[PDB]
Symmetry: C3
Subunit: 621 residues, 3 copies
């Protein structure tokens, strides 16, 4: 709500951040995996590599590259050993492998493969920086403009506008032309100190954000700061903005500097390599390559030059891109940013979002969608206390009407109908046609050839799985495998299919079942993503298959019980969506009642064999 001053603000959010930090530490430290089989290999960069599947857990799918794992050998055929490695490969399903690069090559027990132990190393950095942002916001009233200060504290302040900021032409150099709503967004943002943009799925929030940044960077001296709580989003922004022709720098944490990515050619730590504007540095880097190492002297000099270079590139950049937490990087403190844009601001806890904000924001743009998944908070006490409400949402409650991008370009209209109607008051418009959203070289028989989606009615008993903690449904699993197979045969590719289901029992089971009972080859099914809706947020697929799993009426979790998660689940697909489930178990929740009704009205609630589908006469509600 409202706060009297930044100190009260800090007094409320600090403790929340602490709860969350301690809980997160406990949880991360409780995820040790016991009996791991490891496959050793050699990277082309000469570093030793370890591949290993964690059976008995799905959680390793939440790893980002650069996260560090502690690998120990707890056997008796070799000297007890312990080493740390950084993640270079993150698994896509329950049976997929993690791949890490060790910090030092030897004496890694490369001749033993079994009885290894995997721990996830917990770092307090993110939480430390969140706290630092809160303390800064409290003690330093010049960390944001007076206007934004008042607005953040929920004070009453007359609205304010800036005239004469609009460009002759809105479309940025190198980007598509913007549609009506996108232009209106850019325009409104250029006229205001604080703006909220709502970007529903498929609407081009990235292009719009890149345009905004383009214009802000052209009418400003210092770098524009661009953030997001996830590295994926940040990389996307970085790429569009870069296509703009601006001088863009992608700042990575030092933990993530041995890692490549779609946009690492813009990474700070790569840009300072082989610079002609710093011959001495060249001379040293060269000598750290030809020879193995550098003397103490040459090393100290080397580091000094690296620091100089980093300062130079950061200070002279048009745009700096990094994660919200990344903005707390020491190399960025002692810098100020007038214009800050934060994407996916609805997926970050407020403090996390404040990390970059306290770096001198005078013109702030928050892009997001409060109709989709919000912040993920581990500590239920913390969440219930308020840490689960994004800065976006809180500002919306305080009276700021977000500007919504209206035309969607991702999915076949048939697929956008329901989400549009239920979550966006029917406002979304289709920028692609049915013909545009039909896959080339694809023979698949939809019960309604014009509507690439259906609810496969499936009634089978559920079982308790995951040693008492979860559920599986063999019947639904079988139907999911049948559908998947039919899709692959129709010309689809594993990398373009996605299976969403809330229960780890069903995911583990699906992986095993397809691996040993699938019509086609194991290798095919292994490249298919299987996860809870959380994992798919922010990404798209050609085809999405849902599995609801539950046979009897129930409380529900995941998309079964959360409208936002259902929205996400229903809006990931370009070409086709198939929901495998039991209408009798779902219809108790009003939203699923709406979904089922809509699907039957479209003659697309079905049962029977895949080869010969028929409309279900099923009774529910």
């Amino acid at each position: 709500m409202r706060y009297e001053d930044a100190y009260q603000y800090q007094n409320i959010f600090g403790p929340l951040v602490k709860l969350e930090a301690d809980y997160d530490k406990k949880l991360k430290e409780s995820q040790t995996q016991d009996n791991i089989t490891v496959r050793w290999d050699l990277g082309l960069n000469k570093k030793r590599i370890a591949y290993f599947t964690l059976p008995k857990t799905d959680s390793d799918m939440r790893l980002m590259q650069g996260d560090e794992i502690c690998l120990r050998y707890k056997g008796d055929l070799a000297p007890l050993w312990k080493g740390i490695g950084h993640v270079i490969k993150v698994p896509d399903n329950y049976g997929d492998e993690i791949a890490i690069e060790l910090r030092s090559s030897v004496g890694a027990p490369v001749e033993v493969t079994h009885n290894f132990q995997v721990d996830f190393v917990w770092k307090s950095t993110s939480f430390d920086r969140m706290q630092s942002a809160l303390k800064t916001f409290a003690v330093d009233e010049t960390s944001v403009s007076g206007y934004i200060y008042h607005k953040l504290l929920g004070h009453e302040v007359e609205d304010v506008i800036i005239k004469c900021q609009l460009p002759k032409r809105f479309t940025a150099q190198g980007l598509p032309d913007l549609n009506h709503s996108q232009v209106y967004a850019v325009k409104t943002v250029l006229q205001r100190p604080l703006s909220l943009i709502q970007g529903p799925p498929g609407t081009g929030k990235t292009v719009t954000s890149a345009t905004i940044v383009y214009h802000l960077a052209r009418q400003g001296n210092g770098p524009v700061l661009v953030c997001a709580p996830s590295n994926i989003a940040v990389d996307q922004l970085t790429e569009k903005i870069h296509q703009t022709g601006l001088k863009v720098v992608r700042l990575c944490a030092k933990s993530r500097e041995a890692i490549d990515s779609p946009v690492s050619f813009l990474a700070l730590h790569n840009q300072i390599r082989n610079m002609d504007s710093m011959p001495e540095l060249q001379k040293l880097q060269q000598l750290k390559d030809e020879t193995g190492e550098l003397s103490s002297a040459d090393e100290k000099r080397y580091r000094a030059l690296k620091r100089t270079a980093e300062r130079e590139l950061l200070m002279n950049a048009d745009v700096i891109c990094c994660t919200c937490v990344g903005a707390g990087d020491p190399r960025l403190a002692k810098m100020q940013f007038r214009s800050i844009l934060i994407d996916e601001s609805t997926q970050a806890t407020e403090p996390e979002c404040m990390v970059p904000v306290v770096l001198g924001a005078k013109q702030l743009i928050l892009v997001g969608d409060h109709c989709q998944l919000g912040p993920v908070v581990m500590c239920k006490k913390a969440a219930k206390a308020g840490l689960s409400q994004s800065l976006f949402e809180r500002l919306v409650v305080l009276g700021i009407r977000p500007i919504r991008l209206q035309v969607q370009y991702r999915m076949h209209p048939a697929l956008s109908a329901f989400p549009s109607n239920i979550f966006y008051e029917g406002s979304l418009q289709n920028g692609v046609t049915a013909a545009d959203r039909v896959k080339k070289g694809f023979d698949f028989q939809w019960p309604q050839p014009d509507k690439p989606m259906f609810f496969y009615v499936t009634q089978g008993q559920e079982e308790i799985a995951s040693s008492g903690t979860s559920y599986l449904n063999r019947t639904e699993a079988a139907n999911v495998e049948k559908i998947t197979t039919k899709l692959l045969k129709a010309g689809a590719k594993p990398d373009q299919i996605g299976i969403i289901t809330p229960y780890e029992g069903q995911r583990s089971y699906l992986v095993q079942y397809m691996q040993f009972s699938g019509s086609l080859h194991t290798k095919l099914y292994q490249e298919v993503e299987i996860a809870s809706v959380d994992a798919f947020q922010g990404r798209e697929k050609d085809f999405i298959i849902l599995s609801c799993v539950r046979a009897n009426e129930h409380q529900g979790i995941g998309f079964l019980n959360d409208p936002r998660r259902l929205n996400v689940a229903l809006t990931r697909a370009r070409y086709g969506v198939i929901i495998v489930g039991n209408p009798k178990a779902l219809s108790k929740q009003p939203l699923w009642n709406h979904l089922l009704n809509y699907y039957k009205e479209q003659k697309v609630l079905v049962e029977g064999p895949l080869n010969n589908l028929r409309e279900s006469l099923m009774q529910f509600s």
Copy 2:
């Protein structure tokens, strides 16, 4: 022929079964493989897994899942070891891997990979049950109706009919409409105690059988029994019948309960999991999951409840599905079945077929095809003695005209012409059109674009392979690789191609040759099935390539010398068939003379480079 009484019957068949059992034991025990390299892994169900290729043998392709292997370590870098595992993965060609799950995790020598030894464990169960069926049929004259008793013993008994059994509508709930011949079949079966149905390839014997079972189950109290000598056929029946909406139970041997399959969600051992109708059982299963094991008490109770549940589900089922031998399961003895349907009854020795029959058959339906492969009998003395004649064939000889399903739905008409004319007196009709049997997204140049088949004339010397026991033909192999490659490039997929050849030398050679000399990637060629015609019986592929191998006139084996096997070989393909061979070596057998003549008459006997084919003027006969 005829038998005076069931005791004479038993006196004749018993000894046969014994010969076969002893021979089979000797053979299975003689298949030990010496120097095996093993790859260790962990299943998601925490069980230890071993992958291994058997080079030097092809026989492991006859393994069914659940069959058990004895794995020993015969090296010196670890304590000599011996463990038993069940098959979870069966190989598709000479170089493919077997995968087994060990019975106990440790202390498996997981750190050694070489000099392992593989044995196939022989169980007498099947033969024991065959014998038990014969003894039962001898001592118990209430094991079958009087009518079927007389009919089986080959006695003269006036034909008999049942009026008023026909349904208002023949088509079953959830299944396609039946064609004329299928309806006639269902109808005739509902009017008779004993019926034989002949289902030529592509004719819908599974749909027809499911319809028959549907109706029999609706006009009866107890479960209908549905069997077949192979798990694949049984699974197919189970699926259609299940699509009917009936209460179906798939009974698996206890050896096959850790194994998933296309239809395991209907498996007895899965249906008795998490039953709300038996809360106590739930409570125990839950506790065997959360905790590791159960106390002695809880375990005894647990087993008792499992038995109760199994009895309940079996007694209250509409249909019970299992293999012929599976019907000898103890859980099924003490039950009676009036209506019994046996599919692939022509592929089982009579005793094997009698196993389910002696469970009280009063209305018996035998589906099969005596124009295809019959029973496989190892002991030549036994076979020659009569064990190679199915119950189907013997009944046919005794004067029962089988009812033939007439319209085929699998293959392009061009492909059905010859088999139809030669093996089915030209009766088969085409239920699919040429346009229906043209692959989507497929550029391949057939010498006759309208007829997707040809005989590639190939004259190259043969060599002796497989250490003196077999043959190979490098020339033919090269042409087979060329064709395979051309198919893959044309858009076909490895899983949809099949290579049939009678000689193991040629199969081993083909695998090696494609692995190290194939135009494309190894991974592609590795997923291609290469086998004798036997392995393909009952299954279909998009494309079938034959290799005849023999260069000089010869005795012949496999499809070279057996009309039934040739029928099978020629009827596996949906879209295309290519026979690579030497007409001069084949034309000595009259059937191949017919085939070659027909192929030349269709302007489809060819030679020359694939890219530029031409009609062969070759002279033979």
Copy 3:
């Protein structure tokens, strides 16, 4: 130039060959790789196999099958070990595996996988035979006709013709009809003792050569000799010629006899297996198979019979095919060949080419292309001394106008335009149409849909890589991955894509980058060939991607600085070509200036995002 006699010739070329031999020995022996991880396996032929990647080198891509490697274990978990194996699998990129078959199975350290060492074994055979050819040519004036003697020594000799050698019909049995220029070539060759044929890429030099050989073999008694410096070319000739219906024998070195190949069914060592014309030999081979080995006696007899057989098949063949060096095989000495055809004669040093020539050539045909890559000479002193000039080129200089095949059948006309204009004075004609060269099932948006090619303008900093010795360009790499991915998604296959780049730093980097940052699956990117232009010479791909790498003006290497290499690079593709590069760095070399100008004139010099390409206004030259 000119030589007074064969002794002066020998005196000049001998020393060159020696320089090259010594240099080559030093180089090969300097390529030992230190810390190799090995994967052990078993071939179906029971031989022990080792797979291993050489990170830190690309050179293993120049291995031919049969080349031998020395594998040593330099660890401490097993007895120090050393074994020799022959190459059965050659890598396609920086991270791909070599696979070798050991000479003796045990006691290979199969239980250790790390700290292995790989050496390339150097054999002097090739150079020995080159020297022997030079000595023979010097001392023996009956080693070639008087005419060819004079012509080779560069003496003035009146031209000479042979009347009445032309066939009623030029087209050979089993081959396509020849076009105008091909017929003219065949015709001119049949009328002359010495002929040079120039075959630009895509023109059917193989079909034409097979036709020539066909006719020469029909109007002659002894075998025609057919050679080429590479096994691939030789195999191609062997195949066409074989399609002719002639008795063809492919001679392989004894080192390459355990290796299969596209045309090994014609290999001498396979043809002498199971010969009915030599029953005794049969009897022995059989007995070396059934039993393990042969007694001393049976072995001596066995070898004698093998020799007899080889002599027979070689003497009675219509055509003998082997590599240039292969013609120095002892089994061929003591034979004479009147008609000799040498393909790719422009890719072999003159001595190498002379190896087969000195076997009695009276009618000699040299096929090649001096506008493409010439001989690869390691010793710069040797090369500069003259060893880099092929016999073809030297003869051309001496006044022989090569006969050029004019119509090209490989590439879309759009792709042939530039190479044709710049390297072949515009003479090349298109035998395929644009419609013929559009891939089936391929949705890819070319900036000019009618011209499947473009120059992607890319400006990013370069870095020094490969420990000081090479370069990489992260920006260009990123664009190459984007393009590759777009191609794969469009329906292309990894085996049909090729990436050419001159720098090993960029190749290693590309492999790593795609392996860990590629949009699709690792397995996909791993099957993509990445190499310098050298590796692609003689082979074709559906799509070729160039990477120029250099950001600043420079000396240049590979296709950057060699017109012939650029020709090759630009003429490998059937369907599409994309050059990723910086026009400012390239335009300094006149040829690249021409290329860039042409590309802009076709509205196909572009920049911007792939999804939304735009014409570059870039200024250069």
